[PDB]
Amino acid sequence: YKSHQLIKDHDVKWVDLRFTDTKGKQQHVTMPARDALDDEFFEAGKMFDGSSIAGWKGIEASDMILMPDDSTAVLDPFTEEPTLILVCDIIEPSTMQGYERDPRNIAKRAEEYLKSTGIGDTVFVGPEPEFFIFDEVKFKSDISGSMFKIFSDHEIRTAMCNALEEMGLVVEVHHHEVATAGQNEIGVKFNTLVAKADEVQTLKYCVHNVADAYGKTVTFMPKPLYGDNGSGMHVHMSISKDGKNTFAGEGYAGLSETALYFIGGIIKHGKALNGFTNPSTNSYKRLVPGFEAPVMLAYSARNRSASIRIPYVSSPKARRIEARFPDPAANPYLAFAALLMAGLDGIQNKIHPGDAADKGSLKEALEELDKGRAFLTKGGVFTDEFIDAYIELKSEEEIKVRTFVHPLEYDLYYSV
Amino acid sequence: YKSHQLIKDHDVKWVDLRFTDTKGKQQHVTMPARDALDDEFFEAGKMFDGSSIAGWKGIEASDMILMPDDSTAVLDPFTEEPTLILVCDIIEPSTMQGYERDPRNIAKRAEEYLKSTGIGDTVFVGPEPEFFIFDEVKFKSDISGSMFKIFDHEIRTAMCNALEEMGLVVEVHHHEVATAGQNEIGVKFNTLVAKADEVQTLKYCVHNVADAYGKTVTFMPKPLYGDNGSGMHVHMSISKDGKNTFAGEGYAGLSETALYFIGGIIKHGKALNGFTNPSTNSYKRLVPGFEAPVMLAYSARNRSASIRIPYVSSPKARRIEARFPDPAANPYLAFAALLMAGLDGIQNKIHPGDAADKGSLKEALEELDKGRAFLTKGGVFTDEFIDAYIELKSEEEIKVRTFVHPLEYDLYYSV
Amino acid sequence: YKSHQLIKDHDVKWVDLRFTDTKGKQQHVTMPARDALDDEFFEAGKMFDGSSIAGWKGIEASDMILMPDDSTAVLDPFTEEPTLILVCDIIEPSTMQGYERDPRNIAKRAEEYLKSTGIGDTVFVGPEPEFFIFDEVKFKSDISGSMFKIFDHEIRTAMCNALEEMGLVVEVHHHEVATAGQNEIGVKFNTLVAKADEVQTLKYCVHNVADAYGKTVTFMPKPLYGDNGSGMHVHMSISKDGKNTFAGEGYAGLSETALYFIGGIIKHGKALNGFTNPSTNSYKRLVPGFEAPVMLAYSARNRSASIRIPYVSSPKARRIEARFPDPAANPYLAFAALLMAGLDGIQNKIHPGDAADKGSLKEALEELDKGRAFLTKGGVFTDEFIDAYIELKSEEEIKVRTFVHPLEYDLYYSV
Secondary structure, eight states, X not given: OHHHHHHHHHTOOEEEEEEEXXXXXXXXXXXXXXGGSSXXXXXXXXXXXXXXXXXXXXXXXXXXXXXXXXXXXXXOSSSSSOEEEEEEEEEOTTTOSBOTTOHHHHHHHHHHHHHHHTSOSEEEEEEEEEEEEESEEEEEEXXXXXXXXXXXXXXXXXXXXXXXXXXXXXXXXEEXXXXXXXXXXXXXXXXXXXXXXHHHHHHHHHHXXXXXXXXXXXXXXXXXXXXXXXXXXXXXXXXXXXXXXXXXXXXXXGBOHHHHHHHHHHHHXXXXXXXXXXXXXXXXXXXXXXXXXXXXXXXXXXXXXXXEEOOOOSSGGGOXXXXXOOOTTSOHHHHHHHHHHHHHHHHHHTOOOOSOOOOOOHHHHHHHHHHHTTTTTGGGSSOHHHHHHHHHHHHHHHHHHHHSOOHHHHHHHTTO | OHHHHHHHHHTXXXXXEEEEOSSSOEEEEEEEGGGGGSHXXXXXXXXXXXXXXXXXXXXXXXXXXXXXXXXXEEEOSSOSSOEEEEEEEEEOSSSSSBOTTOHHHHHHHHHHHHHHHTSOSEEEEEEEOEEEEESOEEEEEETTEEEEEEOOHHHHHHHHHHHHHHTOOEEEEEESSSSTTEEEEEEOOEEHHHHHHHHHHHXXXXXXXHHHTTOEEEOOSOSOSSSOOOOOEEEEEEEETTEETTBOSSGGGBOHHHHHHHHHXXXXXXXXXXXXXXXXXXXXXXXXXXXXXXXXXXOSSOTTEEEEOOOOSSGGGOOEEEOOOOTTSOHHHHHHHHHHHHHHHHHHTOOOOXXXXXXXXXXXXXXXXXXXXXXXGGGSSOXXXXXXXXXXXXXXXXXXXXXXXXXHHHHHTTO | OHHHHHHHHHTOOEEEEEEEOTTSOEEEEEEETTGGGSTHHHHHOEEEOOTTSSTTOSGGGGSEEXXXXXXXXXXXXXXXXXXXXXXXXXXXXXXXXXXXXXHHHHHHHHHHHHHHHOSOSEEEEEEEOXXXXXXXXXXXXXXXXXXXXXXXXXXXXXXXXXHHHHTOOEEEEEESSSSTTEEEEEEOOBOHHHHHHHHHHHHHHHHHHHHHHTOEEEOOSOOOTTSOOOOOEEEEEEEETTEETTBOSSGGGBOHHXXXXXXXXXXXXXXXXXXXXXXXXXXXXXXXXXXXXXXXXXXXXXXXXXXXXXXXXSGGGOOEEEOSOOTTSOHHHHHHHHHHHHHHHHHHTOXXXXXXXXXXXXXXXHHHHHTHHHHHGGGSSOHHHHHHHHHHHHHHHHHHHSSOOHHHHHHHTTO
């Protein structure tokens, strides 16, 4: 196991286990390093009680065990004292199986389903999340009024890149001022589904910590400012079978019929996917015309308004599909799994996407998903027991947002 | 003796002797280390006068001797000068036995009673205390008005370091699992008396470190109205010659002995609140709508039950979990009362019934007054001590019930 | 109708209709006097919607009418414009009868029942309320804390003048009898319903005058911990055809009818607390060592008895004094309950026993729940009304009980 070498070499004192909840926050728990030396730590896990977490309320979650994944062990740079970071999974103490409501388990099941189907052997995915940097921000809500206010450089970007390197990510490019003041994006090398999903969390954590250390503030929300561009997360994806780029082929822009069926499935299930790729009321402020955001539910190689793009590449080895609509708020595991299952359904049904294009709301998306749930449960990757609770959470948030009264209403109607 | 060795190694100057009173506060005294070098110190104790203490008022307390327990000797981390720390018991100068009103003596007598009964050889118990951390707190009471007002790996790791230095075995450090400012620290379980001493030391260490960092820390069962309270789950089991007597076959692998234990605890539960929840604040926590238990029953899955059986990998780890106790309870007395209720259940083979599936301080005191029968069983408790304890606890109930509160002004001032 | 002549004499502009809710607060509405001139105003009342009021949340209360009582017409002293004040009763539009939950209707029904039973003819009642005067008061309750703080002939004469102008008959004015800030004004006795209305008018007058002079006045039973509370002594008597039926030969010159009345009151005292002490604050007053009574007995000299026989110079003035009630009680319901208890005592000839010589709101409510019998007797009270009242008071008690108070911080914060 990899953890033993690090512990012995750097006399680590504390071990920090981490895991993502349903909403996407990375909860963590600390313990001394004494009990991590024996292999029993990796052979039996540690006791845990997750009943208090939002998506896991119920009797079932009253007793659980955390199982570390030694593949992800690293050392913490920020802590003044040596500390070993590990990711973990949730295992049901009764059945020794991955918990139904665990997004990481769902992603692993999706990978296993693809492997069993045999259409390909692995899947490569790379996201491109943007973010915003500000000097100060305030917000408050109360039964007597609501307010939000915003107050607004190689050094900070270099520090961010250094921190990411020290984590162990392969940075490729850093952008700034590309579209509007305060917006930034850091490129990173692609990877397999689960590993990339894990890496996104580390990216967010390190960005937040560095921005705080420098006295600024950083936000990933889809649209913080009304009159400016939104923050997107494009997703590049491809499937590999024994080293062959299954998508690479002869046709429109060199896509194979397999890739075209993938696109067709994505198009067919696009409306339902918004429940996972845009799980916030803010997303649909971004998704509007007159801006860089995509509008038409179509695929293209040149049209900027299409939601699916075929990037140009020098070699067939690099042929990939690009989805534009997702947002940083989306949970990585669930978003990637939903996209993969939609594509696989399209491939299996050989749904022709049609001619290449040339020349909503959260409530609506949830309603569409509730009835379109058929394909997600295919193969036992997703389950209705989980989909229902997810829908309840998002519906509660939507109701809360919708019922409130907003300041613009006073301007529009107070005098009438 | 361990103390001789420690003093010789670290040229200690001062010795601190500590003991818990009836209310649950660690009183202590200090001496120069020069006198402790004589074995006569451990063979004869030191003169003491405890008549001033709340629960010991009377003729007897005017003359007592403190007997140190060398097994607990440790070194103080905080004191600038080297200091030794020891726990002590209270012995009557007339007849060399523990004073009737000493909770540690009561716990030791409970252990002896279990050993003599022979149902088992030893008992293992592990509590899970919980606490809140705040930045600033104010409160005041007077005839003219009353007021109260309330206002991060580094600090948690500092607490863990302090506990390790004092000699405990930390296992995990939770953080804001349920609500902001709530924390808990797991610790390796042990026997009854040792675990009680460990709980005392844990409280002392947490308070000292939180003060040193400029914060404040409290163990009150429910400091805030709108948030969850602070409980203390208690896991326990009985061992006989290395055999987990509770381990067996049946519901969740429980033995009939364990089931009778549950039945006894269920029967005597109402009386136990006088020891496990000895504060008016406890019954603010014990209400519906929160994580606190509500129904007096046992179940392995239903979290609303007051007794639970956590899953374990091996029968060797079979234990029983009680939910209702609170941090305010005196460790010695609470553990002794729970053990006695379980032992009575076993003795009378009281069947607990089907597993569940799908009050006030004055009331608790009244119930205890009538249910005192089992506690005095075997002579571990005495009616004299029970009466003194009930009388002492009555004052706080009366004072709280008779005082006027600000909410009343809001509700009735304009009427 | 007296309203016509009053309006013609003083060119009144507005008429203010007033009524009382279940909790005892006086709600009111206003309208132009132009409308009230025609008799149809008195014949048909005016449409009203009481659905929002606490005790009348039932669906039926969504459509009601107000019947003004010409007997209560008066002119408002305070208003700059001429204003005419009237009291009103709640009538069910469908049945043209008094609404089941109107305290004034309940009192009228009790009077009618007494008259029909033939035991007597009329009841004379004199209450003796008290109040406290302060310079300033502040109070606040929030998730983050709680707080409450408290900080001569002119004013007393002004209050007397205001009462006289509104038409009451002042008798005596006591100030600082035993403690600073406590005052009482005596007023002539009268019949039940009229006296009940007079009490509301007196409260309104006192509040308005205190506000005008810039101080604050409260009727709450117990505002300060270390000082005597405020209570309502109720003198009561029954007259039949001009004869004081209570006068007679016996202990302190009472008749057997009066003795049976007292016996009934003593027997049903526990249930009466639900109406004579409907506030948690009252049970802070009801404690030993202060002005409040303790023993549930009757005596002519023992001050601790809850029932007293005042010494009088003539049989005509023979009366019974009840000491336990408090100002927070709703006058209509309190008087009706006392009358019903006394009537039951007389009807069952319950002997009170020898004269004495030489709880909580929860308990009171649960006891009233069982004591429905003697109240529902005669049909004056209704089980639906009793259930709604108990629901309101229980909700209030729960709110008060399930809360944290500053005294708890001083007691248990470090524990």
